[PDB]
Amino acid sequence: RQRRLVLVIVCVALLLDNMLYMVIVPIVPDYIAEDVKIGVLFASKAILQLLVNPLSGPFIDRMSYDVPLLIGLGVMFASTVLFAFAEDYATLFAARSLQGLGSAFADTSGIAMIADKYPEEPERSRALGVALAFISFGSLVAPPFGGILYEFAGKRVPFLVLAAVSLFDALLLLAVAKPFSAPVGTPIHRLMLDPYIAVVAGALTTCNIPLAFLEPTIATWMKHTMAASEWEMGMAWLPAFVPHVLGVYLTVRLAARYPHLQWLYGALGLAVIGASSCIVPACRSFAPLVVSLCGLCFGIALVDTALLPTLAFLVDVRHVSVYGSVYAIADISYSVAYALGPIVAGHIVHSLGFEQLSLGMGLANLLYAPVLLLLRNVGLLT
DSSP: OTHHHHHHHHHHHHHHHHHSSSSSTTTGGGTOOOOHHHHHHHTHHHHHHHHSHHHHHHHHTTTTTTHHHHHHHHHHHHHHTTTTSOOSHHHHHHHHHHHHHHHHHHHHHHHHHHHHHOOSHHHHHHHHHHHHHHHHHHHSSHHHHHHHHHHHTOSSHHHHHHHHHHHHHHHHHHHHSOSSOOOOOOOHHHHSSOHHHHHHHHHHHHTTHHHHHHTTTTHHHHTTTSOOOSHHHHSSSTTSSHHHHHHHHHHHHHHHHOSSOSSHHHHHHHHHHHHHHHHSSSOOSHHHHHHHHHHHHHHHHHHHHHHHHHHHHHHHHSSOSOOOSSHHHHHHHHTTHHHHHHHHHHHHHHHHOTTTHHHHHHHHHTTTTTGGGTTSSTTTOO
8 A cells, every 4th residue: 555545546547637638539520510720629738738837847846746736636627527518619619728737737746746656766667657558548448438428328427427536536635645734946947958858858759749640630541542431440549559558568577677778668669650650651451550550559658668767867866856847848848749730730631641741750750769879878877
């Protein structure tokens, strides 16, 4: 028990958190439906994640990661009960913005708590891997079932049930950890100018471009002239979970036998992601495409559970020992591709076609692994 009971509560608060940013995409254009106006609504979540994260950086490391987590959970509960009482454009826009703010306040605090409660070499990696696996189980296998549940019942009862469950989890966390009972960190604008952190931030912002750009342009490529039914459009990302957990487990296991090596895994993951992005075109069948998607999803875990604890290690070694405003920088890095995707992907696909942007993403991905080589002396720093 002890610290382990908190980890389960935080992890579940992230599984249901990622369920909602991706169960509303197929629901939006059943009400409003000239296509540029609907693009901004889908980009509202990531836009607010860039204008609140720098302001919420120093906020997190000032009151021990509890009040920000509770604030984020409350805001997201408020935003969940608003998606089910909405039919017009403005209400959905406001709900999406509130969801983005709640994510920006909650995910960083949860990751910081997980990193703080497990200070050690062989346990922090395991905790972060568990958190990432719980995130992936909510982000990659849930929306297929949520779509069927909405098609059967609707959008009122399930969303209210989700809000009730989120409130239950928040109340459980409040009862377990009591914040209302009787170290100056490094600011972001000076933490950014670190040669050993900018590379990691760039790798994080580069390893997430293919996921942000494949959606929502993969459906119009599946249905267009290649034998696409309706099941194999929502069931094309579900068999993409086993490689992810396998990669997370493999990287966590290999991070213990070899302690020094924490850049080779990132380079290999980036290479795999680039190769998968390059090979995703030119597959005139469902099975090769789903295999390429499997490889693409597997490559991301290698980068994630090899460059996520590296930030904590660096901020502990050559800075002050507070775990905040660093995962905020990581979140800023991660929330740029998702902001740039649903607005530029359609234009790029219409102009150059779904055969050159994929190679461009692959070439960009295979141009940073050499850059990730300036992380060879980490662990020797004194």
